[PDB]
Design a binder for this molecule. Structure first.
Ligand SMILES: [Zn+2]
Ligand SMILES: [Zn+2]
Ligand SMILES: [Zn+2]
Ligand SMILES: [Zn+2]
Lengths: 593, 603
């Protein structure tokens, strides 16, 4: 496996070994082939095999009780058995070192890309004050940030970083005793790398390829604008387990941002990159016949999934990799160039100085998600660099050319596809869409354990309102949305998020009228909407065409759906009766069928 | 609406009102329309909205990840929201009093039926010693941690608390017998205690097998799932009309004050001490019941204290036998109606003729009982002719309204016994390679795979999980070996779980389950014992030495009952099963395994 640096990872391990000295042992039967194994201690639990169901949403979506994708959505094995299954399958892998020429194209590209990214902005340290305002305004952690003992523990670790040491920065793929430490490890990386998000280095204005701060309602408009650029097909290749395909070489090139930092900042970022990103101590659960053990494992490469900076760094490396693939397709890169150690910077720099930015404007990149419209279709077959870099495509043989899209409306990006709709008044809307079962299925999952009737009904309302705003074009979703909003007390404010997505702007987290909010988003504040004439009725808010709706998972046409649509008032009354005597509205009167 | 007999129910409520004085209140916004409302108190919420998944079984049944009836099984809402949903839907209903002529046919039938049932047996008290030996040995009474009950029977304080309540019963009073709703040692000791007092008076019904086919003619108590199909086939041999297996909508809720009074008639056969305790159970806990039910409020969770005169208590000892008795009675009454013995006229008149009914009972009764297979609310009836299909006057008036069928629509009869639904199964007649016939239990495959995939709440130990998977796997080898997908999945699970690991935790709470699969004995040896050696309907005792001579349903029938055979996804799973087995083994560890896939060598 990894030959570990005990002078970087040792202290972190020694602290774990000492916290659990009673049960600490070295299990010779450890499964780890590609990760370094340090030892185990005794647990349990830590997870659940079945995710909680929202009674409100399930009661108002009966035809979906027999839809397999809907029911699949709630099946997640968080048990040690489950954790070990995914680990052995997806995480315990080694990526072969890219060829010396590949490593050289990557470094030239990364140098140029960071220079380009920092042309107007400058890296900076993020502060305690900045972190505090974020925890407060993003819903146990809120108290920790107000306890001066948390900030004393944070300074303790920062002082170790200044000495090139690491005491508590351990990650885990799974009281104040260990939850104050978790937040402390997150602040220290926020302090050094948080500027990437806070200062919007990945915004479309700054990065050309980025979409940071755009929002789901805007991504489709962006894809449509890219579709306007002369060139080949639109390629949206998915990488199999991207985070695991992040090499020691990608980490070395990502680090180059430090070259733009002031001496005080550069020291803390160097500590994060060196001690936590390029050397990691992980704690993964393992079921034993007896009970549950916690294993202590370490790696040099791969990305840490929960980390601050995972989005921007994945976005940066992907932009770099897609630039390298465009060079290959254009003929600038060859098999000889990737195999050559003494690769010449000249033709690559020439292509970056002259073509670079233009080529970036042909892409929509968000973490591991990319949409690329090359100058021609040779890119489909430009796989030498991609595969050698470790960015192997998911569900496709290694040397099979990529599938390109000729219709932008069909391109997969950020778990959606985007439809162009014509409103009754002739104005066009570009709407986010995804398989309906994925939306209903997710809506049916109550977040956390034993949540009160209030939180349950409010989270249902959050989902219903997200649908009125983003997925109003889906027949089943507008009906279910009206049903939920009629069944939940009007004055009840939506609580808990419907998604952790970067692209979610949570416009539905309100008690404001949904048509008023719809107008703000789609008409008033929409940059691609010239005519600001308001929509006064949901009658003038469009739907997908019947057959597009059916292709995207709609149940319209089904006897079971027609039955549900008709008998929805009874289901609403049932939910009202279960909630109690509260102030409710009827939202069904909007062309009731 | 409810008019509560406060002299009976009062003390029980007063006791609750005391123990929870801090939060006790009368909530004016209570939903109860048919139950009497006494008051509420705030409690810390109980139950789960999602059932735990078996990682072992799910890993070895991948094609079923996309089968809807499979994932359906995992959906159970036990939260206050869920409890209130079911309650408002079925439990909060009133059954109109049967007509005076119906009430009279019912009483004559019930008198005759109990005297027939007690012709050879005599009611008796069940002992503390018997109750302990049953809890210790996890036997069967009313059917996730029974280890709490294991301890309770050893403390003489539990038995002192029992005694206190028994003395109240002897005086016609009730202090602690309250029923808890579904779907702390102090309150646990009370629960078990209420269960024992019920067992002491009425447990003789199960323990002495009053509902065995020998004693009751219609009963199937102690027969077992492997025997029910043979029984249906034997009933199919009796000259008469079609086979009727009508399902009653929420039977327990349709048990009237009149059914409870007729059920009580068993007391007429009891010695004065026994009769005293049974009278206390019937009149104070069955004919007047105090219930604890949860209710979600915007603020939090409240526990509600409600009361009723009629309806059956679902978790009670004696629910099986009493439901079996009333159903036998009701199906006898429906047979009388179809035969012309009962009329719309007869069901109406208060001063009814016992003569015509007794004549039919003394002459026809027992014969008519031998035409039925009754198990609680489940009935299979083969009448003398098909007039029974339209004989709905008494059935509907008694409150035994049929599920998912318009009130006056004639019933659907089966001409093929193999298609008759009974005890969640149907039964296929299979011909073995050697020409011998087997009568096998069968049900939709999705229901079996779905249930297998449910890790029984508590028990998250990889050992407990894999061992419960093995219990399911072995139940399939014995009862559902005839299902292609199930024999393959069974061999896969048994190959994936260490050989010496004993199956633990039950696969079912069914009365008909005999748990022959709860062993490390060879499954083919156990299969032989059950299907050949000890099968009364198997004349030729020639042993089966290979699973290759153990039959399957015909490809067609297997597909009708939910088999995935023919599907590319199934062919893929069948082929790649060794990888899935290795995965579970890797996850389990370095243990002693055995490959059972070559039982098919390997198909
Ligand atoms: Zn650290
Ligand atoms: Zn769509
Ligand atoms: Zn009592
Ligand atoms: Zn069948």
């Amino acid at each position: 496996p990894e030959t570990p640096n005990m002078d970087v990872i040792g202290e972190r391990i020694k602290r774990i070994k000492e916290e659990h000295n009673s049960t600490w042992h070295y299990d010779d039967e450890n499964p780890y082939k590609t990760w370094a194994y340090h030892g185990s201690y005794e647990v349990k639990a830590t997870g659940s095999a079945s995710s909680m169901i929202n009674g409100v949403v399930k009661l108002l979506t009966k035809p979906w009780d027999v839809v397999p994708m809907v029911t699949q959505m709630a099946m997640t094995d968080t048990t040690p058995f489950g954790q070990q299954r995914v680990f052995k399958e997806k995480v315990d892998t080694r990526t072969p070192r890219p060829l010396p020429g590949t490593r050289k194209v990557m470094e030239i590209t990364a140098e140029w890309l960071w220079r380009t990214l920092g042309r107007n902005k400058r890296p900076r340290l993020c502060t305690r004050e900045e972190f505090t305002k974020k925890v407060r305004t993003n819903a146990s952690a809120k108290a920790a940030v107000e306890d001066e003992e948390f900030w004393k523990l944070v300074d303790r670790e920062r002082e170790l970083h200044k000495l090139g040491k690491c005491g508590s920065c351990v990650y885990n793929m799974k009281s104040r005793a260990i939850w104050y430490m978790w937040l402390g490890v997150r602040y220290l990386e926020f302090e050094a790398l948080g500027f990437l998000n806070e200062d919007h280095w990945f915004s479309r204005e700054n990065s050309y390829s980025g979409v940071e701060g755009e929002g789901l309602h805007k991504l489709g408009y962006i894809l449509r604008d890219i579709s306007k650029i002369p060139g080949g097909a639109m390629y949206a290749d998915d990488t199999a387990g991207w985070d695991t395909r992040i090499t020691e070489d990608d980490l070395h090139n990502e680090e180059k941002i430090i070259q733009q930092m002031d001496p005080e900042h550069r020291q803390l970022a160097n500590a994060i990159f060196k001690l936590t990103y390029q050397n990691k101590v992980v704690k993964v659960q393992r079921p034993t016949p007896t009970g549950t053990v916690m294993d202590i494992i370490s790696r040099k490469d791969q990305r840490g999934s929960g980390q601050v900076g995972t989005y921007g760094l994945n976005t940066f490396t992907n932009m770099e990799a897609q630039l390298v693939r465009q060079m290959e397709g254009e003929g600038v890169l060859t098999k000889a160039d990737l195999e050559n150690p003494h690769l010449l910077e000249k033709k690559i720099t020439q292509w970056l100085e002259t073509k670079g930015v233009e080529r970036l404007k042909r892409m929509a990149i968000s973490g591991d998600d990319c949409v690329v419209k090359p100058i021609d279709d040779r890119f489909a077959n430009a796989l030498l660099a991609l595969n050698d870099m470790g960015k192997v495509r998911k569900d496709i043989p290694q040397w099979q050319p990529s599938k390109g899209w000729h219709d932008w409306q069909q391109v997969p990006f950020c778990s959606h596809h985007f439809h162009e709709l014509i409103m009754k008044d002739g104005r066009k809307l570009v709407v986010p869409c995804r398989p309906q079962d994925e939306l209903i299925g997710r809506a049916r999952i109550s977040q956390g354990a034993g949540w009160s009737l209030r939180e349950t009904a409010c989270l249902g309302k959050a989902y219903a309102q997200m649908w009125s705003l983003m997925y109003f074009h889906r027949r089943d979703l507008r009906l279910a949305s009206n049903a939920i909003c009629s069944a939940v007390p009007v004055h009840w404010v939506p609580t808990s998020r419907t998604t952790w997505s970067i692209h979610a702007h949570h416009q539905w987290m309100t008690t404001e009228d949904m048509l008023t909010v719809w107008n703000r988003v789609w008409i008033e504040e929409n940059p691609w909407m010239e005519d600001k004439t308001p929509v006064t009725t949901w009658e003038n808010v469009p739907y997908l065409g019947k057959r597009e709706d059916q292709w995207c998972g709609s149940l319209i046409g089904l006897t079971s759906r027609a039955t549900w649509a008709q008998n929805i008032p009874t289901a609403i009354q049932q939910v009202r009766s279960l909630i109690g005597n509260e102030e409710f509205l009827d939202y069904m009167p909007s062309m009731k069928r």
